[PDB]
Amino acid sequence: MKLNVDGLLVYFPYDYIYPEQFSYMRELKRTLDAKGHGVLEMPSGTGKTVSLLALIMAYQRAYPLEVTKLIYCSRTVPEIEKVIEELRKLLNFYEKQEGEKLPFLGLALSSRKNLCIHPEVTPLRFGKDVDGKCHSLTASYVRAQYQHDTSLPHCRFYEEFDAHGREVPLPAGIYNLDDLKALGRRQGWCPYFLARYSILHANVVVYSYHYLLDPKIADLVSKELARKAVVVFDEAHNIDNVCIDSMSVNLTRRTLDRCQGNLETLQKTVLRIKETDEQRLRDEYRRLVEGANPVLPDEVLQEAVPGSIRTAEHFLGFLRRLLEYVKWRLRVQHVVQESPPAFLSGLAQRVCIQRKPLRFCAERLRSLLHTLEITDLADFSPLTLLANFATLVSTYAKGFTIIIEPFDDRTPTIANPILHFSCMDASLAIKPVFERFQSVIITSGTLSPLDIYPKILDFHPVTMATFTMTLARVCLCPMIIGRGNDQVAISSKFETREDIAVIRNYGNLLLEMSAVVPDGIVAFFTSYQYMESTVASWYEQGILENIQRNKLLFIETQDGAETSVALEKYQEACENGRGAILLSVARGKVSEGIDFVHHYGRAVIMFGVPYVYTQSRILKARLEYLRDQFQIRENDFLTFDAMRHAAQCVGRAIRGKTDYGLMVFADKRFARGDKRGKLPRWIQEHLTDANLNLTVDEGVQVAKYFLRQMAQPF
Amino acid sequence: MDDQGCPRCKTTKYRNPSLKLMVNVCGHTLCESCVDLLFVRGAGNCPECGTPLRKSNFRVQLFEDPTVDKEVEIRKKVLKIYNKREEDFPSLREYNDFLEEVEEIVFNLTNNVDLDNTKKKMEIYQKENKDVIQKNKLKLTREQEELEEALEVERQENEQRRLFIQKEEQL
Numbered sequence: 001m002k003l004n005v006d007g008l009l010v011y012f013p014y015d016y017i018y019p020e021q022f023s024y025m026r027e028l029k030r031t032l033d034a035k036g037h038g039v040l041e042m043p044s045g046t047g048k049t050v051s052l053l054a055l056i057m058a059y060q061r062a063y064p065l066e067v068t069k070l071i072y073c074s075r076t077v078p079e080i081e082k083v084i085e086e087l088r089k090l091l092n093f094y095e096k097q098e099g100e101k102l103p104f105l106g107l108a109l110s111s112r113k114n115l116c117i118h119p120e121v122t123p124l125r126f127g128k129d130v131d132g133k134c135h136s137l138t139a140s141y142v143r144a145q146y147q148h149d150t151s152l153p154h155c156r157f158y159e160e161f162d163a164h165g166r167e168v169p170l171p172a173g174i175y176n177l178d179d180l181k182a183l184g185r186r187q188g189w190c191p192y193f194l195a196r197y198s199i200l201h202a203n204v205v206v207y208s209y210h211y212l213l214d215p216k217i218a219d220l221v222s223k224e225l226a227r228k229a230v231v232v233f234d235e236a237h238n239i240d241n242v243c244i245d246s247m248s249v250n251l252t253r254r255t256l257d258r259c260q261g262n263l264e265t266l267q268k269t270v271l272r273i274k275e276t277d278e279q280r281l282r283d284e285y286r287r288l289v290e291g292a293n294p295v296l297p298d299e300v301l302q303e304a305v306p307g308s309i310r311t312a313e314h315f316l317g318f319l320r321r322l323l324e325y326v327k328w329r330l331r332v333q334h335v336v337q338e339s340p341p342a343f344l345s346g347l348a349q350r351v352c353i354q355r356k357p358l359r360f361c362a363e364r365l366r367s368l369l370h371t372l373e374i375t376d377l378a379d380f381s382p383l384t385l386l387a388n389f390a391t392l393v394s395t396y397a398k399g400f401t402i403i404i405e406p407f408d409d410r411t412p413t414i415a416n417p418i419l420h421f422s423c424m425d426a427s428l429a430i431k432p433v434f435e436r437f438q439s440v441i442i443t444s445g446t447l448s449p450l451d452i453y454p455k456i457l458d459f460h461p462v463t464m465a466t467f468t469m470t471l472a473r474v475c476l477c478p479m480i481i482g483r484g485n486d487q488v489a490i491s492s493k494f495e496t497r498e499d500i501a502v503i504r505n506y507g508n509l510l511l512e513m514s515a516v517v518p519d520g521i522v523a524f525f526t527s528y529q530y531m532e533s534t535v536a537s538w539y540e541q542g543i544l545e546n547i548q549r550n551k552l553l554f555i556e557t558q559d560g561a562e563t564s565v566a567l568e569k570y571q572e573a574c575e576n577g578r579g580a581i582l583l584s585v586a587r588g589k590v591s592e593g594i595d596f597v598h599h600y601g602r603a604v605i606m607f608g609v610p611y612v613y614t615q616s617r618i619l620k621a622r623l624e625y626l627r628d629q630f631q632i633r634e635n636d637f638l639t640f641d642a643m644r645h646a647a648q649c650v651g652r653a654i655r656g657k658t659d660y661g662l663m664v665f666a667d668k669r670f671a672r673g674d675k676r677g678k679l680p681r682w683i684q685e686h687l688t689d690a691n692l693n694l695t696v697d698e699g700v701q702v703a704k705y706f707l708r709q710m711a712q713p714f
Numbered sequence: 715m716d717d718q719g720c721p722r723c724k725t726t727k728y729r730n731p732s733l734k735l736m737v738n739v740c741g742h743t744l745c746e747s748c749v750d751l752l753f754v755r756g757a758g759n760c761p762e763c764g765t766p767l768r769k770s771n772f773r774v775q776l777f778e779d780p781t782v783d784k785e786v787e788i789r790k791k792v793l794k795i796y797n798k799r800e801e802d803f804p805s806l807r808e809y810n811d812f813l814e815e816v817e818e819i820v821f822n823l824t825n826n827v828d829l830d831n832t833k834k835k836m837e838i839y840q841k842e843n844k845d846v847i848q849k850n851k852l853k854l855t856r857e858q859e860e861l862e863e864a865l866e867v868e869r870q871e872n873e874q875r876r877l878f879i880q881k882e883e884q885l
């Protein structure tokens with residue numbers, strides 16, 4: 001299937017493409033031709049990946065100099081595996097068409113914990129542990145000692161990789177993570193480091209955001225080599241939250257105590273090093289005078305001189321002083337306090353800690369800790385986190401804020417206070433990506449309206465188009481139910497949350513919808529506490545028992561183990577005729593991680609508009625700062641955060657292969673024009689005024705009829 | 715307040731944390747209920763060490779770590795010296811070399827004998843006070859004044875923003 005696109009001719013593996021695919025390809029080609037960053041939305045969970053990859057490959061063939069390589073990022077490794085599968089299929093199709101191999105390379109990066117071949121680190125699954133063990137095995141000290149070949153466990157894979165892969169790079173091919181593990185085992189090399197080196201000469205590289213956003217690890221692999229590369233973020237509508245998380249650092253009392261203990265161990269190790277080997281490790285002082293990774297981005301990062309901290313004892317005392325200041329500032333009991341610049345000024349005044357020497361604290365920590373030949377960085381990780389916070393605060397506070405919480409939420413009195421350093425704008429941390437890369441395409445599904453995104457992230461978009469899925473059959477028939485059998489408002493307001501009548505309306509709607517809907521249904525609440533209250537009310541009444549009789553019921557919990565077990569049983573229930581009703585939370589990690597396909601989550605129920613609690617002070621900074629700068633109304637941003645989350649958690653049923661399914665929102669709030677307007681275009685256009693505010697019974701009847709229509713073949 | 719207790723009367727440190735450390739030439743975790751016990755007999759003598767004190771050598775401080783208490787007080791005293799701004803020296807190394815010597819002096823004073831430090835500090839007193847020390851006292855006073863002025867300007871702007879949006883709504 002060769003498509004005569006306006007720009008050029010583009011190959012395509014599958015037989016047919018919908019008109020929305022034509023629109024997507026033409027708009028994407030327009031953006032690439034303009035060579036300017038832009039954002040676009042496409043409904044389908046699958047199909048967008050293949051269309052995007054095919055268009056990018058064709059554009060690379062036409063103008064190889066224009067685009068050096070493609071950097072395609074996905075939320076999670078299980079998801080990016082499907083992307084690499086799609087890319088492998090496309091490459092096989094193109095190779096068959098051409099009749100011969102071409103110099104094209106495509107690979108996926110992942111954590112050493114996810115992929116590795118060392119038996120010692122294999123049993124351990126905790127990421128910091130894998131990082132520390134690998135650092136110990138690959139340490140420059142361990143490398144030098146391996147040169148001596150003394151009796152000590154040395155990781156042969158990295159040494160063999162240094163010997164061979166340095167000389168010879170991999171010719172070409174596509175390697176999934178699992179297949180790359182096998183390749184590393186066969187060749188006695190690192191599946192991780194081999195891909196890391198291939199990044200220098202790779203046409204396509206795929207990895208999650210935390211490999212491309214956080215300055216600590218993103219920069220090293222996203223160096224200026226890709227000066228003009230097509231960087232693409234997929235389903236990255238929750239990009240602001242992750243970009244903020246890449247900067248926010250949380251300091252707790254337990255973490256601070258662990259830091260103090262680690263610092264004591266550091267002092268003891270320094271004394272032992274002084275008595276054992278002093279001159280050779282002191283040469284570090286000379287190289288320092290000449291002049292865990294830094295959290296400072298490219299331009300913000302500075303390397304002039306370490307500062308007043310030039311020796312191990314001096315640096316240790318500096319950390320002692322700063323840790324004492326943080327300890328006392330956290331121990332203070334008072335209302336939540338915000339102080340972005342005042343915190344730095346008060347630190348400098350109270351404990352005599354100048355911001356310039358504080359700036360290089362984390363970098364000097366890395367160097368000095370390397371000198372100590374520590375067993376691993378896992379033990380001292382809390383100290384490195386505190387150092388990253390210490391350097392960040394002295395680095396900048398213009399678009400940041402230090403929040404102190406002597407008392408935690410959900411606890412009238414708790415002896416574990418927490419100090420947050422949550423950011424307020426993601427533009428600060430995502431600026432390097434936009435500036436360095438010629439164009440970035442934020443391709444997303446279920447995207448809340450694009451107009452806000454340029455305001456939140458400071459960039460000038462080239463194209464702003466919303467693509468609506470078009471099929472010969474109406475795959476999706478969304479509806480909103482606001483009126484119950486009692487013709488009573490069913491809004492899940494904070495003041496209306498306690499309403500037993502509203503809870504009863506929700507329970508009856510779920511009962512009837514489970515009675516009619518086929519096997520497999522997922523209901524998303526607004527919070528764990530609200531979900532528990534509704535479940536308890538239904539349990540006190542007889543509605544819950546009737547729901548249990550009609551279909552099996554499963555519930556989500558904060559604990560990941562129970563969540564995984566419940567979802568595993570839910571899948572089997574969906575396969576069998578019992579069916580299942582999975583209650584979950586919109587913010588729950590399960591909602592974002594899981595993907596619902598044919599005969600999975602057939603009818604997506606949304607109980608109440610997803611709104612975060614109006615007491616969490618972090619969102620207060622994040623929101624009022626957005627009001628002050630970029631001029632976004634607080635209510636506007638709050639409703640945007642609700643609609644984007646709802647679209648995220650309700651857009652799964654249309655994953656791909658044209659699998660029918662209905663999305664019912666049991667809240668009259670969605671019927672409001674603002675919510676409908678902010679809803680994604682593809683869902684909204686299907687939505688109509690006739691079914692906008694159906695009663696519970698009318699919604700059930702129309703759902704039954706729509707399921708009848710979708711049951712029959714094409 | 716996290717300290718287990720005074721070397722002698724570790725009681726108050728358990729009942730209430732209101733007591734704050736008292737700095738002395740000895741460098742000690744002294745506590746007010748124990749300061750009264752020192753005043754009654756000796757009147758300015760460390761109980762165990764017996765170090766003489768002119769006038770009780772007592773000043774309030776707030777950190778559970780006695781080492782941090784001594785280090786912070788010594789740094790407070792030292793900052794009065796070597797306060798010249800960085801830009802006064804064009805040499806790249808000299809920017810932080812003198813700070814290295816300053817912190818070395820602080821660590822020296824914390825534990826080792828301070829006689830050499832005092833003699834050196836006399837030498838720096840004579841040579842630098844002639845011109846530079848008083849000049850940088852003036853400049854640091856100017857920057858303290860202007861930082862307090864700038865914070866009051868920030869808070870005037872925030873009060874005006876609050877009250878003007880309130881008057882927008884009511885108008």
Ligand code: SF4
Nearest residue numbers: 116134155157158190
């Ligand atoms: S050096 Fe390679 S094989 Fe050895 S632990 Fe690290 S990633 Fe695994």
Ligand SMILES: [Zn+2]
Nearest residue numbers: 720723745747
């Ligand atoms: Zn006492």
Ligand SMILES: [Zn+2]
Nearest residue numbers: 740742760763
């Ligand atoms: Zn004493």
